[PDB]
Swiss-Prot record, chain D:
One of its GO terms (molecular function) is endonuclease activity. Belongs to the influenza viruses PA family. HAMAP family: INFV_PA. A motif (Nuclear localization signal 2 (NLS2)) lies at residues 165-227. It is found in: Host cytoplasm; Host nucleus. Mn(2+) 2 binds at E64, D92. GO terms for cellular component: host cell cytoplasm; host cell nucleus. This is Polymerase acidic protein. Its EC number is 3.1.-.-. The gene is PA.
Swiss-Prot record, chain E:
Keywords: Cap snatching, Eukaryotic host gene expression shutoff by virus, Eukaryotic host transcription shutoff by virus, Host gene expression shutoff by virus, Host nucleus, Host-virus interaction, Inhibition of host RNA polymerase II by virus, mRNA capping, mRNA processing, Viral transcription, Virion. This is Polymerase basic protein 2. GO terms for cellular component: host cell nucleus; virion component. It comes from the Viruses. The gene is PB2. Plays an essential role in transcription initiation and cap-stealing mechanism, in which cellular capped pre-mRNAs are used to generate primers for viral transcription. Recognizes and binds a wide range of cap structures of target pre-RNAs which are subsequently cleaved after 10-13 nucleotides by the viral protein PA. Plays a role in the initiation of the viral genome replication and modulates the activity of the ribonucleoprotein (RNP) complex. Belongs to the influenza viruses PB2 family. GO terms for molecular function: RNA binding; RNA-directed RNA polymerase activity. Influenza RNA polymerase is composed of three subunits: PB1, PB2 and PA. Interacts (via N-terminus) with PB1 (via C-terminus). Interacts with nucleoprotein NP (via N-terminus). Interacts with host ANP32A (via C-terminus); this interaction promotes viral RNA synthesis.
Amino acid sequence: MDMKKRIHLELRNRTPSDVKELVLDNCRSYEGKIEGLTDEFEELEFLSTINVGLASVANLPKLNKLKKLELSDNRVSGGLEVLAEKCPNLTHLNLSGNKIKDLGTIEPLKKLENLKSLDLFNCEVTNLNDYRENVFKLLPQLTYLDGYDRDDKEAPDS
Amino acid sequence: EFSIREPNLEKHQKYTVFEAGHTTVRMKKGESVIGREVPLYLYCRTTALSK
Amino acid sequence: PMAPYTHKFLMEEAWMFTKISDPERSRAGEILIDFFKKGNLSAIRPKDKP
Amino acid sequence: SKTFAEIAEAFLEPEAVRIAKEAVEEYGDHERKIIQIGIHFQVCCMFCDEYLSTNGSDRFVLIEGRKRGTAVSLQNELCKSYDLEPLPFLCDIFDREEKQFVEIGITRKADDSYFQSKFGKLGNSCKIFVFSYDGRLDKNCEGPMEEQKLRIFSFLATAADFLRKENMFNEIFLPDNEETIIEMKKGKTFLELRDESVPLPFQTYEQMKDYCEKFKGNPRELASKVSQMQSNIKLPIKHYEQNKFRQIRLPKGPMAPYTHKFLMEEAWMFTKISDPERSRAGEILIDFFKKGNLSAIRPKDKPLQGKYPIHYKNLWNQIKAAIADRTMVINENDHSEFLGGIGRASKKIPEISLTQDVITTEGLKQSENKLPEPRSFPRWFNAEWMWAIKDSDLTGWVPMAEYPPADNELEDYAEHLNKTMEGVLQGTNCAREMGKCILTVGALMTECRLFPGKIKVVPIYARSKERKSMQEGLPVPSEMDCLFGICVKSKSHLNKDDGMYTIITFEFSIREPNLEKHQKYTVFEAGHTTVREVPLYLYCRTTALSKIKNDWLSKARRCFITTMDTVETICLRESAKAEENLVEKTLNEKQMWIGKKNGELIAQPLREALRVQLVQQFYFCIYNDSQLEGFCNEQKKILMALEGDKKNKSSFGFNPEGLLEKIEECLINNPMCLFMAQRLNELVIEASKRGAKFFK
Amino acid sequence: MSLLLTIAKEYKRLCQDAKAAQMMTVGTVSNYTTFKKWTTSRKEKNPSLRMRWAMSSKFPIIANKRMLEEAQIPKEHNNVALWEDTEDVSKRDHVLASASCINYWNFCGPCVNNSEVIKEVYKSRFGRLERRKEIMWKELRFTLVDRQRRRVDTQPVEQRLRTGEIKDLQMWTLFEDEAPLASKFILDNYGLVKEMRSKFANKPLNKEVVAHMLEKQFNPESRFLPVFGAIRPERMELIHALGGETWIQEANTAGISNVDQRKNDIRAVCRKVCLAANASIMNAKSKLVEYIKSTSMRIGETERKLEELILETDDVSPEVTLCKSALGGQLGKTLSFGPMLLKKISGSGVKVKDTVYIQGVRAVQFEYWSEQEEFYGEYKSATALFSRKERSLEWITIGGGINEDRKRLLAMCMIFCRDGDYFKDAPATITMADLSTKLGREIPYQYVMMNWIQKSEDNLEALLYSRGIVETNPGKMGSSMGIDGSKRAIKSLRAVTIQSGKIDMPESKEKIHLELSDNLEAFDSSGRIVATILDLPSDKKVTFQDVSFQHPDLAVLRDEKTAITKGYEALIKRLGTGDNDIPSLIAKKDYLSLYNLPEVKLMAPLIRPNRKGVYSRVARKLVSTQVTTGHYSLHELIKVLPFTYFAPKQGMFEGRLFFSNDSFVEPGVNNNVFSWSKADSSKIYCHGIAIRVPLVVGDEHMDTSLALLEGFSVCENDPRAPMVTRQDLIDVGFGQKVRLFVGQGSVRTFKRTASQRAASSDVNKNVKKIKM
RNA sequence: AGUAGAAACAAGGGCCCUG
């Protein structure tokens, strides 16, 4: 469909200032660009955008109370510093299914001191040597990676 | 041949590549097994041999 | 330009489907047919444009 | 399409189609009504819907599709069994849970008129339902089942969309009960005429129609009239072998003079090297002017031949002056006005302002058209033809594009052959004349488009490239700009195609003229020029052109196409009969007759005979007129008869003398026709030594 | 927006006038088309001339003005003009310009983000290019060619359609907002439309161009041309570069476009079903129609109905003809007598009776035609032109290239004309058993002799000997045929002519509506037979790929998988409109009433009994999760519902859901038992069989009103109901009414209630109830 | 003047414009 209509539909007369969750999976966004998002969404604490032909994060507005994001199945690559500019209170992140080549693209995420878990699956970076260890040495605050902590400690349900 | 890793233009020059739907990957989850779907690629190539 | 891949098969970028081994069907003509029965190959439908 | 049945089959079931077809056949009505009936029938079907009653039996019974007698029989049977009153008229369906017939109607008009007529005709006896293609319903009782309504309205919507798409959503195909008689509104005047245009024996269209609709064949009278007409005719049949072809009688009088605007053989040119920066004409005409040779010229007041020499001299002086001013423009004086016909157009006189005294004052009779006058055979044509066969000391006279890449043997072969032919042809003299015409006509067309109502100055020039010697000496031969003379236009106000804009031609030559050939020119003795020194002449004349001749002369590269076609055809035919590459051999070996010398025939390989065909096509492009058209159209019969003679096919004809007359009628003051006719006579003569059907 | 307001102001100003008002008020909208012609009418005789006469000017082109200002297109860039402020006489909103402007735009003008969409717009020509690049050329040779003329197709095209099926397709992809009512071709071919829409949606494009290109993408250009060698569209598109009358550029082009495989598969399926129906004795007609409509096949990615492809193809085979006849499909005037092909050129006639004695005295009636007629005939690599006259072969000419083909064609022609003494006194070898009636179905002596020839070559030799033999006269040596099929001999057959060079196939753009009998023999408004079931190969076994024989008789599966499939079918049929169905319950979020459906109660016995509770738990869980929110996938509930009938329990769920027959389905991944794709969301594949899901509701994937049209229907117009758009159409309640705008100049009233049946049954039944 | 053909042009509209 289109993120615009999808959003206008999810907003069943509700103001964009009292919601705590949103989902936009199986949609489309022209030019891989956000469309319909604003700073009006303040109480939002979760977001899910999956398989929407996304390629970048540039129109994403400032969301502080947000603490979990999902961008899988898209082809984003390179833009990972806004997260500090827009969502510095973020804790859970997921990027499995996107275009990620090296670690220099990952370095900005160190500034997300509130980060706890990250999910990278099916990406090129995973096909390197000593990547989990090097990443942990890069992002020390982090504890979970793709659902597994140091020593391969399976993470709980929730 | 089958693969789940998109190619690079340099190393893969003699290969003709396609995209054949998707597949599944299996990994442990506590005391059970799960399945995570991924894409799938098809690597086509011609070559000769001898006795 | 860089030297390209030369070997016949793939080493690192490979992938494989699995199944249980039957000593009564331990031959290529049989293994291939069995792999084909469950229909995972028939699902392989490459698009026109590469 | 192609029949109403195939159309109905688009959105209907073929079963109901066949049903309604058999029905109209029963009533023998116009088959344009196949649609309405089928629709009604299908509705009835989908109205039954295989519904059932409390007793597990069918609820509705269909009667429309049945024959009329059988339908009435069933109607009475049901009215009797269930103890119902017999209806006066027939119905379409009957129900059992209510035990009363039901009638269905349909219409397109969004109004109750049809339902009002039906309700008046039947009052409230039974249940009536009329639907509308646009979603309306009129009835006399409770509404039908929902599903029925949905299923009916959807079908009707689809059908209406289809019909509107086919333009058949009109009263014609969907009439009401009354408007079922469509007919041409035969008026009064049309009938008055039709009864007047009838053949003689009849006097009213009714008699003719009755005679034609009942006409029977009587072969005997037909054969008798055939033989009778076959006896009062006496169609002559003439086998050519017995009745031979006489020679053609050319006209008599003076000789046909030069007609082409530019000189070909007598032309002299000044050459220089071309710089890519200065490439336009208005520039080269100055470059050649600075060195002083163009200005060294200074003719005298005493012409060898011609008329109005003073005007020509003054015009040349004005041309030189304008060139000196760096402006290719000329002023309007008496001389140019005369040699430009600037004031020549006649002054109109309306008839409303006319009277007999005016006529008697100055005779105003109907113009007496002075058709062209005859001429004789030109003796200078063979000279030009032989001169246009030799090289010109240069090549690249005619511009050509580049050759694209190649991937298969076919394109390689094509490129090789094309290169051979182009290299052979680009070196001749006819080629430089073609390039001259191309470029000069392009410049003149541009000027006529941009600077009308203004006398301009345009050169007669061309561009070429010196031939390629061996690697020795100076390599990479250079290019060259050549100038043969000057041209001038006169107010090309081309209001309409086929118009005329007079021009003038100042050309350079080193060969004295002939009265017969250079009749129209007005030559002057200019001076001397180098090579040693030699005298100089200045051929001058006047002529005109039009849009069409400009466009066609600019497109003078077709001769290459024709020649290549002929040659490649010959070579491929010779190569196929032997299944081997025989092209170079066919070009270097196969001999073609060209002409006669010392009473004997002459021959040379095709590689050198291509030039004859090329010159032939060029002349066809130059001297083209109605005369040459008719001639070349009427000569084919002679060639076909010749071929028949070569193969011993006993040809025949009805009236060859008339053919010869038609041919000789279009031979007037056009050199090409005369030359080719004399050559055709010589052909038939030379063949009489080897064939029949020709007299000497 | 403001533009909309401007359009309204312009409409107002225009209605203020009287003539414009009269014309916009009177008549319907179709008048527009007419008005489109009376304006801007001007032609020219020789556009070349006027083009050289105009381009010689300063500003010969027109162009928009505001587009130039917005694009910042200057004037007199480098002392060279580009345009000047003026107003053309016709447009009044365009300005003169020069061709230089066209370069100035191409070199320093506004650039769009991407333009690869072109490759889709002109897909046919890029396909031409690719097919060309994948060729391996070969040597060139010179020789004469036997180029036969005939009607063929030059444009390779997949899913060839009609014109009425396109005028609609050009709308649902591009200009949907003004789309007409949904036609059957749309509801059937949903995935096709979805595909064509995914590419040309939310894009800056000129749409008329796209429509024209789609017409070309669905048009096989049929031409009457000379041809040599094989016949395939892949070649005819470049025949100009393969060979002429005197030359040939050899090249291999066999492995491209995979066209003829589809046709041979179709013909094999047709043969199969024809034989099947022939197995019957009294209803082969209805049996065949049922087998047809109960069958489908895949084309590339999409699944198409057989009866739909059959009415689009043009394969003149004795199998396709029968089918196209059963479905009332019109066709050409082409005959078929066994493997050969025939076509009538001229003449007439009528049936006549005659008899022959098989062995001793055994009278058997055989018919012939009593008049003169002329026929063209085409067998493998062989052509012929002959004439029949009162049970005799008057003359015949041949232009083939083989002796065997030339003898077989001659023999079949002689048979077709009943020429010879055998038809007067049959041979002893034949008997009453070989006569006819394998199981009761008679056989005319014609096809009898046919099979008698196909049996042994010596029968063929004897038949040829039945034709007069004489001594080869002088001169005719070249135009003579021996018994072996030699171009010359000392003694040759009677009334025969040979020659090098095939015969030019005739042509006629005619159509005829024929019929057939209960014995599968078609007739054409006369006693002539165009096809039958004796003219095809006897039988053969084949394994068809990507096909759906959803019919009991045409099925090989056992009662178990068939029961599973029928249970799924029944469970899907509850996907319609009305309460008690799954859509209304989902809308009401009554995830519980689904567990109590009767269909799950009928499929329960098939569940593995030792673990039915555990699976049930998982299923119910998933359902609630999907139902409570609204983010559900209709293709998973229909799969997991059959397990929710029992009571939940405790246990370890491995990941699979087994039935009682060691066949499972997995919730999220496609398998042999239950598969589907986001591309074609209107199909469900179970055990290879296909199932068509109705279009009543649309989940996250489906993203238009196309998925709702099978839930709506037309009803009596009601001015009270509101008027809404095509997007708010999803927010209505099942059973409600609403007014709406359709296509152009048309308003109607719709209701979200479906109608299960189609006209095929409600007419046929009521008809059969009339022949009694 | 001249062109060409089997009749037309050799400017036309209002001192100004135009093919």
